[PDB]
Amino acid sequence: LDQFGRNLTAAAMEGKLDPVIGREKEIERVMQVLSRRTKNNPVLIGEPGVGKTAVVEGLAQAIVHGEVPETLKDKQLYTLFEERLKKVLKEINTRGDIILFIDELHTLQTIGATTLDEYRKYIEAALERRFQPVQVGEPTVEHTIEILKGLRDRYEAHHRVSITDAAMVAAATLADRYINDRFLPDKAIDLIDEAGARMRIRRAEVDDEQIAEVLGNWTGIPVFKLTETTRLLRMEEELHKRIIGQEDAVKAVSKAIRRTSGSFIGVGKTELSKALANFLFGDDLIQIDLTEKVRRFSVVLFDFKNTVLIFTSGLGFSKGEIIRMVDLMISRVAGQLKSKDMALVLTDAAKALLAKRGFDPVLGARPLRRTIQREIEDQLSEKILFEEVGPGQVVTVDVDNDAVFTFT
Amino acid sequence: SLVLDQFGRNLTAAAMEGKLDPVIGREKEIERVMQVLSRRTKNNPVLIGEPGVGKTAVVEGLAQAIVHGEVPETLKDKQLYTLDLGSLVAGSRYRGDFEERLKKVLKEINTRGDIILFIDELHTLVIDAASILKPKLARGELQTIGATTLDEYRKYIEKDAALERRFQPVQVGEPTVEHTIEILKGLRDRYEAHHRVSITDAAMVAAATLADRYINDRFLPDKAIDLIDEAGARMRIRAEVDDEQIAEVLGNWTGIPVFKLTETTRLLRMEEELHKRIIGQEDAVKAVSKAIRRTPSGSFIFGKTELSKALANFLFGDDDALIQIDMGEFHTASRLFGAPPGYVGYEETEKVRRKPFSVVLFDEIIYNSLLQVLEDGRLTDGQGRTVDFKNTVLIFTSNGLGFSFRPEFLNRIDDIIVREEIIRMVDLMITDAAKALLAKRGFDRPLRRTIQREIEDQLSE
Ligand SMILES: Nc1ncnc2c1ncn2[C@@H]1O[C@H](COP(=O)(O)OP(=O)(O)O)[C@@H](O)[C@H]1O
Ligand SMILES: Nc1ncnc2c1ncn2[C@@H]1O[C@H](COP(=O)(O)OP(=O)(O)O)[C@@H](O)[C@H]1O
Ligand SMILES: Nc1ncnc2c1ncn2[C@@H]1O[C@H](COP(=O)(O)OP(=O)(O)O)[C@@H](O)[C@H]1O
Ligand SMILES: Nc1ncnc2c1ncn2[C@@H]1O[C@H](COP(=O)(O)OP(=O)(O)O)[C@@H](O)[C@H]1O
């Protein structure tokens, strides 16, 4: 009747349907399954946005162009209370030259399209006998580039702008890298369409920089990172900005990861991994002591293409920078005092005593924080409560004489 | 029949119209179902069998028998109606949505009187459908035919004694390869007509045998017919169907070269194929090739790991067929059978069961189980399920002071296996002086690490 659903083949002949390219194998598989005595109905399985309806559109284009076998050339695809459904089904049966495409079959000769999860939940026992799953893989960066080239003319016509091939390459690569949550065929198109809309709003051409700034606006990442081995030659400075000492290890790690993802095996290790994760990705990383976390570009620390893996770990008669760490640790106390209108100053002898008492060569700087808390935070808080130190005063910490601190 | 026509298909009417396919070699099951249905009370057969074996086919055969009139006097004119509980429950969201439709169907059946229900997936029956149907099934006023697999029947229907006693089990075994070939020959005409192609009996035999050999998760009558249908469709998208096309289809399904599917001649190239993947140790590979060629399938005592990997790749499966077991850490019940019931490790032999065709390599090598495996080729884990080794191949690996295995174990094993070579190795893993330096550095396992540390490292930068 066509009042319950659109005719895809009529639209394809009219040319309304967008072209689909690079999916010849999926269309061939669908045709094969449709040409089977049993399990005749193929159901397309794939992640959202992959192009599950794109393959059906390509099938419609093929039939209208006549590339399909004889048994399908004369058909006419249709895309879709009980009385009306029964009447339309009777019409389909009596006509018999129609293949029904039911988008999102999980809501329910025919074709269906649903995600793997919904396919398992809703379809996967009586239907299984009549439905044959067909996998629709995610396009790669080059396939996405080809699709973008195909859609360039339509999007330019719609937005009255011009898009360069470099823009397509940048869109595909950046969307794949940063927009990982989404899936490439749809997210690259999204980026291109949004750049075109931006250009239309401004007033024409589109360049890689426009795509980069659109993505930066979306995700908040600075445009510099998106547009910019540039990210690798700056590792040394951006790592020494946070790690104290262990410069040789920093250099070795930077070189080893520059060559290459990479793999590696009580001082600095966790801090170094955190700095690496922040520099290479942006956030301060996974610590264990997992598949869902990594699957959903991260550094994994112990004690997947882009993931970085990091691991950490006589009888008788024989013979014959820490001050910088202390400053960093007391930085928090100094800042909190500043918020209280106070300026903390520590003498060289005071820092030396603090490092001596709170630094364990066996355990590294682990007991340093508690030592600072014991010797300074407690005494300072007591003195603040006694009112002997008031706002606007400079709190100077000295050591006398085993020894003992003193506050002025 | 309007109330029933919206939930199922009248199989008897389909047979009257000739739409149902022929059923070949199922006279025994059909007769047994007739016997069960002829009873006075609890005349509710339940077809037990793994999916795809032909339970629904048995029911269609019964419908055809009813149509032809050969059934006993009690079953004459009886109408077979399928019924899926999914349709009844689907769309139900309120207190009595499903009871209403189930009672409606039961009332229609009572009014008609001559209706026999075939309820596929009877294990889903278990105030619900089971409670509603129980008072009627016991008195034999509602003849029903179920269809479930053995495990589902045991763990759903059997454990409910009240419902269990109302259903008579009827075993439907998987057709044998000869039975599958006969079934295919029975179906040949319909598929030929549908696909407009011709199928040779050689193609049918090849389909049945290859599907039995390679597809370890489907069942003969279904997978063989699936292979035939897929081959017909592939021909259609482009006539006659031959063994080569079936082999191509199967290879496309499961990753396998087409020429391999299409064995003495193929097994004669053992040394030639093995030397491609491994070099050196010519005597050992020749001995292994001879022992396998003449002939659990095989057992050996033993590079070692490389040779086992190459052998597995050449034999059933790719290098993934290898199953490495570190025997050092067992110097223990976990490896043998896991643990007995009621002890830690019962929930988790483990790898052999899922991969019957595999090469089991033991590293650094309790002995009673190994002896049982070697002598009888079977073992029993802690959960009772038996795991077979009749086709697997077992490999066991093993490791100047002063002035200058139990015998039966050693007998059961089929056989024992024990400068330019390094030059070949270095270029296999990738100047003459550089090659010699690499050989001296990595050889006297470390060779790959040395190559990576020096050559790949310096070339990358
Ligand atoms: N191979 C392709 N050719 C042309 N366009 C494609 C192709 N693949 C995906 N697209 C794009 O994918 C977008 C969504 O289509 P689709 O993935 O089929 O919807 P859904 O997966 O949610 O059912 C469309 O905007 C379409 O342009
Ligand atoms: N190898 C390590 N490197 C850095 N921090 C570690 C390491 N091992 C443990 N830590 C833990 O984290 C804290 C030490 O961090 P810290 O010494 O202040 O970093 P840094 O030495 O780089 O300034 C302690 O709680 C310690 O237990
Ligand atoms: N004995 C047989 N004779 C003729 N055809 C058969 C026979 N057995 C199976 N077939 C075919 O093989 C398939 C078997 O599937 P089936 O066993 O009926 O499903 P179920 O899992 O419900 O028992 C069907 O397509 C059937 O047509
Ligand atoms: N360092 C290695 N890493 C991975 N595979 C190796 C390595 N060395 C040898 N192989 C494989 O082992 C074969 C040589 O046998 P070998 O390793 O020397 O066993 P064995 O030392 O017991 O005689 C080679 O054909 C090669 O394929």
Swiss-Prot record, chain A:
ATP binds at G46, E47, P48, G49, V50, G51, K52, T53, G266, V267, G268, K269, T270. Disruption phenotype: Depletion experiments (using anti-sense RNA) stops degradation of anti-sigma-E factor RseA. It comes from the Bacteria. Residues 1-203 are annotated as: I. ATP-dependent specificity component of the Clp protease. It directs the protease to specific substrates. Can perform chaperone functions in the absence of ClpP. Degrades anti-sigma-E factor RseA in the presence of ClpP2. Belongs to the ClpA/ClpB family. ClpC subfamily. This is ATP-dependent Clp protease ATP-binding subunit ClpC1. It comes from Mycobacterium tuberculosis (strain ATCC 25618 / H37Rv). The chain holds residues 171 to 821 of 848 of the full protein.
